[PDB]
Amino acid sequence: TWQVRDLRRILRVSELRQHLRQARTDFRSTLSQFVYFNRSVVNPNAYDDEYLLSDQRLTYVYVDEVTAQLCGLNRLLPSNSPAFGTVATAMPPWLLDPQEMNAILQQSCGQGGFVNYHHGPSTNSFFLAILMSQLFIRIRTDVIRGQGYGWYARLGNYVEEEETREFQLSDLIHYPIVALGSCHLTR
């Protein structure tokens, strides 16, 4: 089984980048077989319909200090928007000033999820790095200095930029965490 990489004491940006790169590579090697992760509620024989996409870059779910520890260490992904939505971004922990990342997250996510970015920058001072499942959809592209960054949502009230499938709908879901870390970075 995968053990989450706890990068909360890797706080120099160069070194953090190396650790996150290695975490993704190590994680992908565990996915050479089997990409399902959550067991069916209606079937003892089965996993549910949610699977990870192995051939993908890490995305980030920004969180407060306590959430990073409680979820990151315990294979839990929290919602950060109403109707059980989890918003993730390609925008890495070292890209934007913490206040500016908060401003953008507030424009991107409403109130009512487990993490509420409307409480201010403390809710994005830490991060969970994940590989997204097939349930995440691209909701927009931000351009920072010539470079595009995807934003993605699992459920919530979002559209791409009757349901027959079994998957989790709650404010905390069982989900493989690649890494957890802090945005309190230095040279």
Asked if 156 and 108 count as a contact pair (C-beta separation under 8 A), the reply is: no
CB 41 within 8 A of CB 53: no
Count of structural domains within the chain: 1
- Whether 94 and 123 have beta carbons less than 8 Å apart is answered as no
Q: Are 19 and 185 in contact (CB under 8 A)?
A: no
User: Which position has the token pair 């993908």?
Assistant: 56
As a whole number of angstroms, the distance between CA 44 and CA 50 comes to 16
> Residue 23 half-sphere exposure, CB side, CA atoms within 13 Å?
25
Q: From the DSSP assignment, how many helices (H) and strands (E) are in the chain?
A: 3, 9
SS3 141: strand
Which residues partner with 113 through β-bridges?
Answer: none
Q: Which domain holds residue 97?
A: 1-187
Q: Determine how β-strand 136-144 pairs with β-strand 126-130.
A: unpaired
Q: What is the C-alpha to C-alpha distance for residues 91 and 88, in angstroms, rounded to an integer?
A: 9
Q: What angle do CA 150, 58, 113 make, to 5 degrees?
A: 70
The phi-psi region of residue 183 (left if phi > 0; otherwise alpha if psi is between -120 and 50; otherwise beta) is alpha
Residue 172's nearest CA partner among 57, 61, 31, 20 is: 61
Q: Are 41 and 50 in contact (CB under 8 A)?
A: no
Structure tokens at 40: 């069916």
Q: CA-CA distance, 126 to 153, in Å (whole number)? A: 19
Task: Kindly calculate the radius of gyration of the chain based on its CA atoms and give it in whole angstroms.
Answer: 16
Q: Is the CA virtual torsion 79, 85, 90, 91 positive or negative?
A: negative
Resolution of the structure in the document, Å: 2.1
Half-sphere exposure (Cβ direction) of 139: Cα atoms closer than 13 Å: 21
Nearest to 2 by CA among 46, 45, 35, 44: 35
Instruction: Answer yes or no: are the C-beta atoms of 105 and 124 closer than 8 Å.
Output: yes
> Are 132 and 88 spatial neighbours (Cβ–Cβ below 8 Å)?
yes
